[PDB]
Copies of this chain bind each other. A is one copy, B any other.
């Protein structure tokens, strides 16, 4: 019984050791794609989170989580969740997932 991400999961992935980031491991993300796709492909679409808001319009506030952070809705990316050590830390509020998706929807159409 290994974890497979589902939509709305707040996940931590290991930082990418090839990027040369000064920040330690653990990059938080919100999973957008559904379990069936994630499970059959080993990939998922997700948006990265940051603890520090800057007041940019695609930021979505995530409340109630262990820490206060924001999802960056415009920064959608496909990740190989297996290879990135995805671990579920929590779930975002349905209103928060919905808002992330709405912003992306408007951006892509």
A105 within 8 A of B: yes
Give Cα A89 to B107, complex, Å. Answer: 22
Per the 8 Å Cβ criterion, residues 21-68 of A in contact with B are 32-34, 37, 41, 43, 45
- The secondary structure that dominates the A interface is mixed
A88 within 8 A of B: no
Give Cα A105 to B102, complex, Å. Answer: 11
A105 — nearest CB in chain B belongs to which residue?
B109
Residues from chain B with a CB closer than 8 A to the CB of A105 are: 109
A82 within 8 A of B: no
Q: Give 14 new A-B contacts, CB below 8 A, not counting A18-B20, A76-B76.
A: A18-B19, A32-B107, A33-B108, A34-B109, A37-B74, A37-B107, A45-B74, A45-B107, A45-B108, A75-B78, A76-B77, A76-B78, A101-B108, A105-B109
